[PDB]
Amino acid sequence: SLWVDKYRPKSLNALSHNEELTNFLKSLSDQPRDLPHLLLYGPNGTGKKTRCMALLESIFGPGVYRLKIDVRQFVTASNRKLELNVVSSPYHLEITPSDMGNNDRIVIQELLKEVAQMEQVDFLAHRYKCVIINEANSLTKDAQAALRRTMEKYSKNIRLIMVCDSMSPIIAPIKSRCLLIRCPAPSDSEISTILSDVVTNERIQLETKDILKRIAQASNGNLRVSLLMLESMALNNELALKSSSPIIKPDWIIVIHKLTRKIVKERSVNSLIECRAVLYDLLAHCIPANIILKELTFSLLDVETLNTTNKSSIIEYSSVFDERLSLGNKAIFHLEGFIAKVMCCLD
Amino acid sequence: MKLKLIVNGCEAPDDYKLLRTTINTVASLRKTAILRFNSERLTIISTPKDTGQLWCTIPHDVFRLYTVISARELNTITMECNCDSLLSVFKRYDRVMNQGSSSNMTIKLQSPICALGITFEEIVHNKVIMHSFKVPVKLLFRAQDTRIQEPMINYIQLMMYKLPPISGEFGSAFHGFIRRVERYSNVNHIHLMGVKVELKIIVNELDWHLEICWNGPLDSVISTHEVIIRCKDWKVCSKLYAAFEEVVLAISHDESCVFHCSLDRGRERGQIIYYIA
Amino acid sequence: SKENLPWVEKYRPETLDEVYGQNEVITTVRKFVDEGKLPHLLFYGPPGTGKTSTIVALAREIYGKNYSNMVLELNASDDRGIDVVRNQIKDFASTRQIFSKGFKLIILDEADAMTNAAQNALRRVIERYTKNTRFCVLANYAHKLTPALLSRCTRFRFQPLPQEAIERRIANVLVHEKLKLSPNAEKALIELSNGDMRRVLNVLQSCKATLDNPDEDEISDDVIYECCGAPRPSDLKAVLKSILEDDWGTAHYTLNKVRSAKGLALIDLIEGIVKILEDYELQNEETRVHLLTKLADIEYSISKGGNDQIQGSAVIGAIKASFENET
Amino acid sequence: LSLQLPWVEKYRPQVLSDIVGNKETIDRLQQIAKDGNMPHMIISGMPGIGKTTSVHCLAHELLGRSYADGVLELNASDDRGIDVVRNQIKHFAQKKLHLPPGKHKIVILDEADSMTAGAQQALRRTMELYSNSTRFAFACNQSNKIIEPLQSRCAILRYSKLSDEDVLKRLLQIIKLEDVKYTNDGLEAIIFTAEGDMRQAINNLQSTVAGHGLVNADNVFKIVDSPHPLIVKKMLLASNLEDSIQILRTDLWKKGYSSIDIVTTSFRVTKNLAQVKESVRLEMIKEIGLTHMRILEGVGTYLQLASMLAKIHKLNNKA
Amino acid sequence: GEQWYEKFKPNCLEQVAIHKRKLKDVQEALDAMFLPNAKHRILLLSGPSGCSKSTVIKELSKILVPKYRQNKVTEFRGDCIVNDLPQMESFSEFLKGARYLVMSNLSLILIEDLPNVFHIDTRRRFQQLILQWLYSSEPLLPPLVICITECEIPENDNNYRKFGIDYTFSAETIMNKEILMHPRLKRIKFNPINSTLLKKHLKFICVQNMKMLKEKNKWNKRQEVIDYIAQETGDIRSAITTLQFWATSSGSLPISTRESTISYFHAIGKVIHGSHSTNNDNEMINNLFENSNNLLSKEDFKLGILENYNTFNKGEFSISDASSIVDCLSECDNMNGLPESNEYGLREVRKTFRNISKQGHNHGTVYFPREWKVRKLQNSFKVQAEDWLNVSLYKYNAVHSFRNITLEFGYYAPLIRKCQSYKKIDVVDRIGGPIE
DNA sequence: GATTCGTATC
DNA sequence: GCTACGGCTATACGG
DNA sequence: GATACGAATCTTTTTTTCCGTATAGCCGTAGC
Ligand SMILES: Nc1ncnc2c1ncn2[C@@H]1O[C@H](COP(=O)(O)OP(=O)(O)OP(O)(O)=S)[C@@H](O)[C@H]1O
Ligand SMILES: Nc1ncnc2c1ncn2[C@@H]1O[C@H](COP(=O)(O)OP(=O)(O)OP(O)(O)=S)[C@@H](O)[C@H]1O
Ligand SMILES: Nc1ncnc2c1ncn2[C@@H]1O[C@H](COP(=O)(O)OP(=O)(O)OP(O)(O)=S)[C@@H](O)[C@H]1O
Ligand SMILES: Nc1ncnc2c1ncn2[C@@H]1O[C@H](COP(=O)(O)OP(=O)(O)O)[C@@H](O)[C@H]1O
Ligand SMILES: [Mg+2]
Ligand SMILES: [Mg+2]
Ligand SMILES: [Mg+2]
């Protein structure tokens, strides 16, 4: 199995990263009756979903990890007959409405208005059902406007624990009604300790423990990425982490690095068309354009042949075109504009 | 996997009419149905998985022949069959016996997708006409079979009401009571009420408010009980009560509603349960 | 039952003599009525100028007690599509007049919300049945009207209400409500009105509600500014004096003290300082450009939220960095 | 009340000799009316230049006493769907009314630009098969809204904006038939405010004589305002910012014009603005659109218009 | 007393205004489909209006049908309301009755007036019936010719859900990809009539109306009229109509002809390289927006500008100009489709390419935007990721988001399943393919 | 509207 | 003479 | 023989109203 989902902690006491965030989640779980709506924000791969699961385990007891998957059908005005999978379980419900698309309003106005009007009276404690909204930052600003009053009015029988990263595109009313829980990413020491736990449990033979440190610095505070890297390296090296084991990286990262090298080396219109071809290839793989722009910028800023003026111009164009892409429809225009501006500023 | 059964409508009218009561309901509810052939009993299931679920129990003594063998537990094989074709075949046999006949149904499982060899005979007036039909069905897996279980209903201190039989003096009055709300075109929600014995059909909306009442006698074998239900489920309840003498109504406070139907074959009794959320 | 109505709808002009401000339009439509020929009219102007009151009073004068059966008032609350244009308006115009011996009137309020398909089908309805029916079109945005429909209707412009008309209506409201208004408060009400009588009535009602005893006390400028939550005329010049004459440490303190003494909003101070600075004699032609292009961006960012203190400091920065050009 | 029709309908020309303007087209229409052979024609132009009263008068003269049962006028107020084209137009074309030689039945499809696509594609066959008896006279404001196969079989007659002398002649005819006191400057102001629109000239003249009687510059300009595109052009072609802000405020904001109307007219004026470099024009278009977006999002204030004018002057002085 | 385009119609095939190569190709095709076992079953003729698409078929029939007929054409009439016949089965009945037109009653079926293909329910029936004809098991069928006129559908509806049939009336918006690419469908696309056959066939009409043109002294300004008409239009019907309207006139009325719709690649070339007639770019842009608003006010046009601005000098222009083009195209994407956005994004590019416009430049060939392939690859990736999530939650117990899949579990998990499982049913390759 | 290939004609 | 059922028709829905 | 001309290629999947079909309700007529 995947080592990410085979060593995931399943309790609040099995979560070893931040002692301060566990001691606050335990305080929240001490009196579950007055639990407010929670918004967990932090870097990706920290373990916000695992901590949400541990909080649900501490509140509702065990049995929150047995997930049943049912597909619910929603009909728009044009009778498109849209679709959405609803991962659910006893005592809690999980939804990622942003996947539905721009029609996430039609699911937060149906599921979140039908489970908030059930009162959960079983056979007399009404209790509340915790709804986890994965990727709360991907809502189209209309799902949140129909959610604020929904979770304000029906707070007696429902609680919302929204999981998101970089909670900038979340509107102020949502953040006002939600208790914001910051989840800092672990340092390299904690990641190395966790990787040590995995390698002694999996009995793989490592040498020069520094390798786990290397994986920690390469993952950039991402436990999921670090564990996937460790599993790939162990499998490719036959369960033997040699000191010269190649730190494998995602292919799109290498392609973006090659794009940065092409931009630095060649600055012409034909090179710009080749960059467009690379960008279209990346876009065809459902890679978000904001992440592509961020990786391109932070890989162009790592070039040692560029002076301070060029790097300042690159970061200024990056901010401008990121704001342009956030308020646009077609991202290819913004990506080409950023690449062309970088090419013009470099030469 | 060998499945073979023989039905005679003229030999036993009650168990046969309950089979007509089960097939019409699963045709009216939704397309396709689930048929689990347990070695001692049959159960015809229409699972939409808010929409209601029906769980009708059919014993093994209803048919002349109930030879059922399979490699699964208790000789259980589960079919998925389009209800339109079997309903048409069943209507054909209804017309066969209406014109005057006493022939039986030979139904055999002839081959995961299979079919049932529902063949019978008809005589016009001393002529031999053989009616052969093949309804394509699919074989549900055992792992898929155990995913389907009957909804549970409890009454810690709730309230089931004994609906008067349709053969009595008040049976037609209660049938008119149930069908009174069905006359209105623009109705989608009905609010049932429970007082302990009176039950009322209440439909309150923005600009109009129905409040139908039953002033006749009622019985409750051995507190407020209200539920919001759809109109189509009420139509299904009307159709189920029209063909049943013993009808049991239980109302839960804002949780669910159950329409229980039973035929006293005594012998195992055939029962129809309509779970409504 | 008219005393249980809001002041906006309670003081609706019932006759054409109670419509103040618009004089060249009233004195033209009255001559149109007296002569006997009423052309297809178009009423254009800002909201709250008195168009929907003028047309209803005009039709009441024309028809008297036959208003109900000779006026087809259609507004944005009705599905004024092409089907309605062809199935209700057309047969109201086609049928003969009901005993009045004159023409029928079809009033299309909020015609800017009508689709182009429903507006290109009304043109020949207007042209064909001109003899026995007339059309009045009321709108505040003339860019949504088709040019042919704009050509088929005589245009009357409802100007923003002048100060004299607003003050004469204020006098009538004060007489009816037995209220008193200070001379310095009437000017503030007129200035905040921006040519809208609905604002006059909605502010005066809240001013009456604010007074402890509405039969002896007077509505001063303080009452108006507290009820409508607007900065005082002195708090709009003290902040500007601090920004244009003090340093960057005390101007911020003055701004945050002015915004906390009475809880004033940043956008009101921005729109007041803009009006104050518009009268300035800036002699660089770039100070004005910088002030406008920066304060408009701050105003646009305020409308979408964000940090209030950051925008408040941005106003100080935009006003300070602009006058550096002048000096 | 009274039965006195408005002068737009009271003085609608009933003969082709009373329709002023486009002399080269009206003369050809009269030649068609005398000869008889009327080709399929599409008459297009700006509103109010005499496109409907020309076709109606041509049909009247061409058909004489057979006008009631020789024409079929289908306007946008009628359901001009595909069923109507397939049934009513087909049956009118199949009619065998006997006419003087050279005369033909006329289907006056006024406002043909609003007709749907399938109706026009059926009209294709309708004029293809039945062309020896009936003729189609399309009247529109934009010729591109009629499909190309329909335009192929027709003769395009492009009506133009009426000059300041034809409108003056018609206005003088009306003033002579209505005993209206006038002055030359008042009539010139009426022509200026008409913008080549005879209907909007008659309406303004009627309003002026009803409100004040004498047609002078003061009595005209106190009831009907100067065209707002010509004020927007003056605002957008100023030299200083303090001279463009004055024309914005005192002539468009205190007069009662909405900000969205000002921006929409500014875009049109910029598109047709002359003696302006193309880079300056495209930058002005961009700055007008950026303010249009802000106004459409909610901030329709005078400060935004002032900022737009300031950015236009910024792009004017150096950029 | 008749229109000149009906009294001067071609009687033979040599008077038809068509190019010799086009006529020869149509002749070969039509003679091919009249054979007993013809490879082609339906002949599709696309092109603008008045390109003799039906003037060549109705004269080829008179010379081809009475040669293979054992001992003219059968046009479908749309306006035929049979009693007891719903308006969707008229074409079906026409096809059923037209399949009996074989030897001893042989006739070529011509479909010029297509059924009401502007309705979504009968266009599907039209396509299905044509597919049935193309896949007919009947060993012997009459030849079928379908003439579709390529015309731009004017903007009348108010919705952004407009389909292909609400933008252009072409053979692609009426016939699906299967019918167009069917092996038994020969498509001979037509072109507008050139300025030579139009100049000859109009002088023919003039020298036939010699008497009328001489009486009105319209014989010294003749060629100045035919040349202008031929240079303006490529229509054989509108040219004759204009000639009749000018000759029958008795004044100085400026003649006019129907306007042509500038195509997609034509408008892209006009924006990038400029027009050969007008040297004023403002006038050209204004006329393009007032004549082709249904094409300029879209997203495919702004995508094509970005995909084809590199073909001005085959990529041999300054990068500072490319940046000034793409930054304006990106600023236009944030204007939310306002009319001031396209008018800026088409003017800035034209100004940029005019400021660097010098002779001797060998331009490139433009191409359609490639976003339609990117979206299809994205949909394939969506399906593959859905399958990955489905197989990762029934053969195991783990819930993972789509974004996490595309970022980490679309590449690392395939490698792990290639080593953990394959090295020592499932998903083993990269989701949606490698990054190449 | 641009390039490339192919004719027909003067 | 009365009722069931087939044919005709008005109306809401769908793309 | 030079050149103008011409063809081929450069391509694709919120709202409002409309056109045709589906469907239930009602009336006319055969027969028990
Ligand atoms: N000239 C006026 N004299 C007196 N009261 C007025 C005048 N103009 C407006 N009002 C008041 O303002 C109220 C609203 O004005 P209306 O005429 O109903 O609407 P409107 O002025 O046409 O603005 P819009 O365009 O419809 S939003 C009226 O009911 C009156 O009470
Ligand atoms: N050339 C003209 N001579 C005389 N009156 C004219 C002329 N043009 C317009 N009119 C007047 O305009 C009115 C009739 O306008 P129409 O001719 O129906 O308009 P139109 O030019 O067809 O524009 P649309 O398309 O209907 S907006 C009457 O008052 C006419 O007297
Ligand atoms: N020399 C000629 N060559 C071709 N067509 C001619 C000629 N002289 C007259 N015509 C007429 O011009 C018309 C051309 O029609 P076609 O092009 O054959 O039809 P089409 O291609 O379908 O055009 P659409 O799309 O229906 S408008 C016919 O009515 C012919 O009779
Ligand atoms: N305290 C911890 N100890 C060990 N592993 C952890 C811990 N916290 C998180 N993880 C790892 O993180 C992975 C899940 O991360 P995830 O919840 O997706 O992060 P995020 O919520 O930021 O996206 C799990 O596979 C788990 O192994
Ligand atoms: Mg109003
Ligand atoms: Mg008209
Ligand atoms: Mg043709």
XYZ file of N, CA and C in Angstrom, chain A residues 1-2 4-5 44 67 69 94 135 222 224-225 228-229 231-232 235-236 238 248-252 255 268-270 272-273 276-277 280-288 290-291 321 324 327-330 332-334 336-337 340 343-344 347, chain E residues 299 302-303 306-307 309-310 314-315 317-320 322-323 326-327 329-331 333-334 370-371 374-375 377-378 381-382 393 396-404 406-409 411-412 416-417 419-420 423 430-436:
348
model
N 0.824 -1.202 0.000
C 0.000 0.000 0.000
C 0.860 1.254 0.000
N 0.224 2.398 -0.238
C 0.923 3.673 -0.156
C 1.320 3.950 1.287
N 1.903 6.717 2.627
C 1.227 7.895 3.160
C -0.023 7.492 3.933
N -0.802 6.559 3.390
C -2.077 6.165 3.972
C -1.978 4.914 4.836
N 0.521 23.028 2.227
C 0.065 21.721 1.775
C 0.988 20.623 2.292
N -15.286 5.054 5.722
C -15.901 5.980 4.782
C -16.708 5.217 3.740
N -18.939 5.723 0.234
C -18.928 6.651 -0.890
C -20.240 6.497 -1.646
N -18.179 14.500 4.274
C -17.043 15.178 3.589
C -17.435 15.547 2.162
N -10.682 21.894 0.184
C -10.399 22.994 -0.739
C -11.464 24.085 -0.636
N 6.612 19.093 3.232
C 5.467 18.349 2.708
C 5.641 16.886 3.107
N 3.460 14.410 2.744
C 3.007 13.550 1.656
C 4.082 13.413 0.587
N 4.662 14.542 0.172
C 5.711 14.509 -0.839
C 6.918 13.744 -0.321
N 6.165 9.975 -0.322
C 6.161 9.446 -1.685
C 7.577 9.348 -2.244
N 8.405 10.361 -1.981
C 9.802 10.330 -2.405
C 10.546 9.174 -1.756
N 9.293 6.335 -0.575
C 8.833 5.067 -1.131
C 9.388 4.841 -2.532
N 9.378 5.880 -3.374
C 9.907 5.743 -4.727
C 11.399 5.438 -4.713
N 11.947 1.817 -3.463
C 11.556 0.826 -4.459
C 12.511 0.811 -5.646
N 12.994 1.981 -6.071
C 13.926 2.048 -7.188
C 15.331 1.598 -6.812
N 15.792 -0.837 -4.453
C 15.590 -2.163 -3.864
C 15.784 -2.134 -2.345
N 14.371 11.749 -6.384
C 13.453 11.846 -7.511
C 12.504 13.017 -7.298
N 12.155 13.699 -8.378
C 11.285 14.862 -8.322
C 10.153 14.686 -9.321
N 9.025 15.372 -9.116
C 7.928 15.278 -10.087
C 8.367 15.733 -11.471
N 7.819 15.070 -12.492
C 8.240 15.324 -13.866
C 7.901 16.743 -14.306
N 6.738 17.255 -13.894
C 6.376 18.620 -14.259
C 7.322 19.637 -13.634
N 10.244 19.677 -15.943
C 9.886 20.350 -17.190
C 9.825 21.862 -16.991
N 13.699 34.833 -27.636
C 13.254 35.194 -28.974
C 11.783 34.825 -29.114
N 11.203 35.193 -30.259
C 9.798 34.889 -30.512
C 9.598 33.388 -30.699
N 10.509 32.733 -31.424
C 10.407 31.288 -31.610
C 10.564 30.550 -30.286
N 9.665 31.834 -27.515
C 8.391 32.093 -26.849
C 7.311 31.124 -27.323
N 7.324 30.767 -28.608
C 6.357 29.795 -29.115
C 6.637 28.410 -28.540
N 5.238 28.455 -25.185
C 3.792 28.242 -25.255
C 3.452 26.772 -25.431
N 4.212 26.066 -26.268
C 3.974 24.637 -26.438
C 4.167 23.895 -25.120
N 1.199 24.729 -22.845
C 0.010 23.983 -23.243
C 0.117 22.524 -22.826
N 1.314 21.944 -22.948
C 1.523 20.573 -22.494
C 1.289 20.453 -20.991
N 1.778 21.426 -20.218
C 1.542 21.420 -18.777
C 0.064 21.611 -18.451
N -0.617 22.490 -19.189
C -2.028 22.761 -18.935
C -2.904 21.569 -19.290
N -2.494 20.770 -20.276
C -3.250 19.584 -20.658
C -3.259 18.516 -19.573
N -2.413 18.648 -18.551
C -2.302 17.674 -17.476
C -3.025 18.120 -16.210
N -3.946 19.080 -16.331
C -4.766 19.564 -15.215
C -3.910 20.090 -14.064
N -2.819 20.765 -14.403
C -1.975 21.450 -13.428
C -2.470 22.889 -13.321
N -2.826 23.369 -12.128
C -3.357 24.734 -12.011
C -2.346 25.774 -12.471
N -1.956 28.893 -11.535
C -1.320 29.634 -10.450
C -0.097 28.894 -9.922
N -0.207 27.574 -9.763
C 0.924 26.778 -9.297
C 2.038 26.769 -10.339
N 1.085 39.469 -13.049
C 0.406 38.475 -13.868
C -0.338 37.444 -13.031
N -3.467 39.213 -12.484
C -4.200 39.179 -13.746
C -4.862 37.823 -13.970
N -8.046 37.146 -11.900
C -9.239 37.835 -12.376
C -9.439 37.662 -13.880
N -9.055 36.505 -14.421
C -9.161 36.248 -15.841
C -9.883 34.941 -16.123
N -10.039 34.664 -17.416
C -10.698 33.455 -17.893
C -9.732 32.479 -18.544
N -8.925 32.943 -19.494
C -7.942 32.103 -20.164
C -6.571 32.408 -19.576
N -3.643 31.108 -20.533
C -2.535 31.049 -21.481
C -2.049 32.454 -21.820
N -2.975 33.414 -21.906
C -2.594 34.799 -22.166
C -1.689 35.332 -21.064
N -2.064 35.095 -19.805
C -1.274 35.596 -18.684
C 0.081 34.902 -18.597
N 1.817 33.479 -21.099
C 2.637 34.019 -22.179
C 3.088 35.444 -21.899
N 2.213 36.273 -21.330
C 2.616 37.629 -21.005
C 3.741 37.666 -19.991
N 6.980 36.434 -21.758
C 7.492 37.454 -22.667
C 8.089 38.632 -21.907
N 11.445 37.534 -20.642
C 12.409 37.508 -21.739
C 12.861 38.913 -22.115
N 11.932 39.871 -22.132
C 12.290 41.244 -22.468
C 13.151 41.881 -21.383
N 17.037 40.387 -21.296
C 17.950 40.916 -22.346
C 17.810 42.440 -22.438
N -14.100 34.303 -28.264
C -12.836 33.935 -27.640
C -11.877 33.261 -28.609
N -9.546 35.935 -30.283
C -8.439 36.372 -29.441
C -7.446 35.249 -29.177
N -7.889 33.992 -29.240
C -6.949 32.880 -29.153
C -6.152 32.722 -30.444
N -3.307 35.242 -30.618
C -2.167 34.781 -29.832
C -1.454 33.611 -30.499
N -2.187 32.772 -31.227
C -1.579 31.625 -31.889
C -0.939 31.966 -33.229
N 0.193 35.498 -34.150
C 0.997 36.714 -34.235
C 2.468 36.424 -34.510
N 2.907 35.177 -34.351
C 4.293 34.814 -34.611
C 4.573 34.548 -36.083
N 7.668 35.153 -39.762
C 8.044 33.787 -39.394
C 8.796 33.762 -38.066
N 8.408 34.646 -37.147
C 9.054 34.773 -35.858
C 10.211 35.746 -35.801
N 10.794 39.032 -35.519
C 10.537 40.392 -35.067
C 10.952 40.517 -33.607
N 10.981 41.757 -33.126
C 11.493 42.042 -31.792
C 10.602 41.436 -30.713
N 11.239 40.990 -29.630
C 10.496 40.427 -28.508
C 9.763 41.521 -27.734
N 10.254 42.763 -27.787
C 9.568 43.867 -27.129
C 8.210 44.159 -27.755
N 6.403 41.531 -29.226
C 5.626 40.370 -28.807
C 5.088 40.554 -27.395
N 5.907 41.106 -26.496
C 5.432 41.400 -25.149
C 4.321 42.441 -25.160
N 1.159 40.431 -26.257
C 0.600 39.502 -25.278
C 0.126 40.187 -24.000
N 0.794 41.246 -23.534
C 0.306 41.910 -22.330
C -1.034 42.597 -22.570
N -3.229 41.494 -24.840
C -4.170 40.382 -24.941
C -4.540 39.807 -23.578
N -3.620 39.840 -22.615
C -3.912 39.410 -21.253
C -4.727 40.435 -20.479
N -4.472 41.728 -20.696
C -5.288 42.771 -20.088
C -6.712 42.763 -20.622
N -8.365 40.039 -21.357
C -9.064 38.903 -20.768
C -9.695 39.240 -19.425
N -9.231 40.295 -18.759
C -9.781 40.714 -17.477
C -10.890 41.746 -17.615
N -4.951 25.911 -30.621
C -4.791 24.529 -30.192
C -5.412 24.262 -28.827
N -6.242 25.180 -28.332
C -6.867 24.978 -27.034
C -7.880 23.841 -27.048
N -6.024 20.795 -26.092
C -5.650 20.861 -24.683
C -6.830 20.479 -23.802
N -8.028 20.964 -24.142
C -9.213 20.618 -23.361
C -9.525 19.126 -23.442
N -7.318 16.656 -23.982
C -6.326 15.988 -23.142
C -6.647 16.174 -21.663
N -7.150 17.353 -21.292
C -7.555 17.594 -19.911
C -8.716 16.694 -19.508
N -7.387 13.297 -18.923
C -6.752 13.284 -17.609
C -7.794 13.212 -16.498
N -8.912 13.923 -16.662
C -9.986 13.880 -15.672
C -10.537 12.468 -15.530
N -10.014 3.363 -3.848
C -10.959 3.439 -2.743
C -11.846 2.199 -2.650
N -8.588 -0.446 -1.906
C -7.945 0.049 -0.698
C -8.946 0.947 0.021
N -8.467 1.689 1.020
C -9.306 2.634 1.763
C -8.494 3.912 1.963
N -8.623 4.839 1.016
C -7.909 6.107 1.071
C -8.624 7.114 0.185
N -8.885 8.300 0.727
C -9.528 9.383 -0.007
C -8.478 10.450 -0.289
N -8.334 10.813 -1.561
C -7.379 11.826 -1.978
C -8.042 12.779 -2.960
N -7.652 14.047 -2.879
C -8.256 15.085 -3.696
C -7.700 15.051 -5.117
N -8.428 15.705 -6.027
C -7.995 15.767 -7.420
C -6.709 16.572 -7.569
N -6.611 17.708 -6.872
C -5.417 18.546 -6.968
C -4.181 17.791 -6.498
N -4.305 17.065 -5.384
C -3.208 16.224 -4.924
C -2.865 15.156 -5.951
N -3.168 15.394 -9.342
C -2.428 16.026 -10.433
C -1.047 16.501 -10.011
N -0.859 16.858 -8.743
C 0.430 17.370 -8.295
C 1.414 16.288 -7.881
N 0.961 15.263 -7.154
C 1.871 14.233 -6.585
C 1.477 12.802 -6.961
N 0.208 12.400 -6.831
C -0.236 10.993 -7.047
C -0.579 10.701 -8.512
N 1.995 11.014 -10.816
C 3.329 10.609 -11.241
C 4.011 9.653 -10.277
N 3.939 9.913 -8.969
C 4.630 9.060 -8.006
C 3.923 7.720 -7.843
N 5.315 3.893 -8.291
C 5.247 2.937 -7.189
C 4.534 1.664 -7.630
N 3.413 1.804 -8.339
C 2.712 0.644 -8.875
C 3.487 -0.052 -9.986
N 6.814 -0.426 -9.743
C 7.923 -1.121 -9.035
C 7.354 -2.067 -7.972
N 6.482 -1.557 -7.101
C 5.925 -2.389 -6.000
C 5.152 -3.571 -6.591
N 7.230 -4.790 -10.955
C 8.613 -5.327 -10.830
C 8.608 -6.596 -9.967
N 1.756 6.989 -16.093
C 1.460 8.345 -15.649
C 0.065 8.758 -16.101
N -0.642 9.480 -15.227
C -2.022 9.852 -15.510
C -2.058 10.839 -16.665
N -2.828 10.506 -17.696
C -2.911 11.355 -18.873
C -1.647 11.360 -19.705
N -0.780 10.369 -19.506
C 0.454 10.275 -20.244
C 1.572 11.082 -19.614
N 2.814 10.794 -20.016
C 3.963 11.560 -19.515
C 3.920 13.033 -19.894
N 4.950 13.780 -19.497
C 5.028 15.200 -19.819
C 5.799 15.313 -21.133
N 6.000 14.174 -21.797
C 6.772 14.074 -23.039
C 8.174 14.659 -22.889
